[PDB]
C-alpha cells in the first residue's frame, strides 16, 4: 500500500541512480510487480524503462 | 577428485543423472533406462531414486565427497533423487533450479489435441 516515490516526493528516475534499482528488482533479476513494490501505476512504466535501459548498459544483470 | 556437480534432468518420461567436476568434466552417469526401466515406469520417482544411488556408487570409488545439484525440467523426480543422494551417504551443498526459460525463444510445438 505504501508508495515509495510519492512518499519521499521524488520526480522522474534520473536513470544513472543505480542504487534503488536493486531494491526494485528481485535478487533473481526479475523486476518486482506492483503487488509487492506498492509503487504508483504511472511511475511503474518509467521504472521498467529505466531498469531496461540500465540493464542494456550492464549495470544490472539479466539473470542472477 | 573430491568435489563435483551432479546434474539431473526431471522430465515427464525419464530422469537422467550425471556427475561432473568443477571444470565441467564428467565422471559417470546413470538413468532409468540404464538400470532397466523401459516403459512409462522410467518416469516414476522410484526409477530416479534408483538412478541416484547408482550414480553415487559410480562416484565414490573415484573419491568425491561434496556435491551440489542442478535440476532441469519439471517432473516427479525432482524430490526423489535429491534426497536419495544424501540417503546414499553423500553431501550435497546446494540445490540449483536451473532450467532453460527463454524470454520468447522459439514457437513451441502444436497442441496435443488437434
Amino acid at each position: 500500500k505504501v508508495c515509495y516515490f510519492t512518499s519521499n516526493g521524488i520526480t522522474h528516475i534520473d536513470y544513472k541512480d543505480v542504487d534503488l534499482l536493486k531494491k526494485f528488482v528481485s535478487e533473481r533479476g526479475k523486476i518486482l510487480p506492483r503487488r509487492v513494490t506498492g509503487t504508483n501505476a504511472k511511475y511503474q512504466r518509467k521504472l521498467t524503462a529505466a531498469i531496461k535501459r540500465a540493464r542494456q548498459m550492464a549495470l544490472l544483470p539479466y539473470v542472477s | 577428485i573430491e568435489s563435483g556437480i551432479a546434474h539431473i534432468r526431471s522430465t515427464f518420461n525419464n530422469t537422467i543423472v550425471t556427475i561432473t567436476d568443477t571444470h565441467g568434466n564428467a565422471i559417470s552417469w546413470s538413468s532409468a533406462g540404464a538400470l532397466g526401466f523401459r516403459g512409462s515406469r522410467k518416469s516414476t520417482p522410484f526409477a530416479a531414486q534408483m538412478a541416484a544411488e547408482t550414480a553415487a556408487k559410480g562416484s565414490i570409488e573415484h573419491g568425491l565427497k561434496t556435491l551440489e545439484v542442478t535440476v532441469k525440467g519439471p517432473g516427479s523426480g525432482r524430490e526423489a533423487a535429491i534426497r536419495a543422494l544424501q540417503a546414499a551417504g553423500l553431501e550435497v551443498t546446494a540445490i540449483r533450479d536451473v532450467t532453460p526459460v527463454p524470454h520468447n525463444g522459439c514457437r513451441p510445438p502444436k497442441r496435443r489435441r488437434v
Partner: protein
Amino acid sequence: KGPVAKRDVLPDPIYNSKLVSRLINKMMIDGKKGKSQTILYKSFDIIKERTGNDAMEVFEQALKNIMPVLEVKARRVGGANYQVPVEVRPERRTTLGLRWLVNYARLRGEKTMEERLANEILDAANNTGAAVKKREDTHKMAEANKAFA
C-alpha cells in the same frame, strides 16, 4: 457402507496358550464339522513321531515361514492394467497364509489327507514347500513392481 468384522473358534479366556487354543479350537477351515476335528489332531501326532519335539512348534514355525508381508492387486489405468503393490493387514496375513496351506494340502496328492497336510507343514517348516513357493513368487512379483506405490 463401513467396516465389519467378527470373531469365532474362540478357545477359553485364561491360562490359554496357542497350542491348546488350537488343540481345542481354531483353523479347521476345510469343510463341514467332522472330517475336521478329525483328519487333524492326528496329523499333529504323526509329526510328533516324525520330529523329536512338540508337534505344535513346527506348525506356527511353518506358518511364520509361509506368511507374506507384501502382495499386489490389479488396478485399471489407461490400457496397461498396472499391478500395484500393497501391504497386508494383520488378519489378512493369517487368513491367506492358512488358506494357501490348506488348498495346497488338498492339491499336492499322496495316499491320503492327513499325511498330505503333515508333509506340507514340515515342507513349510523347512522353507521348501509348494505354498512357500507361491509365497516367494508373490513376493518377487511385488517388489519387481514396487515402483507403483
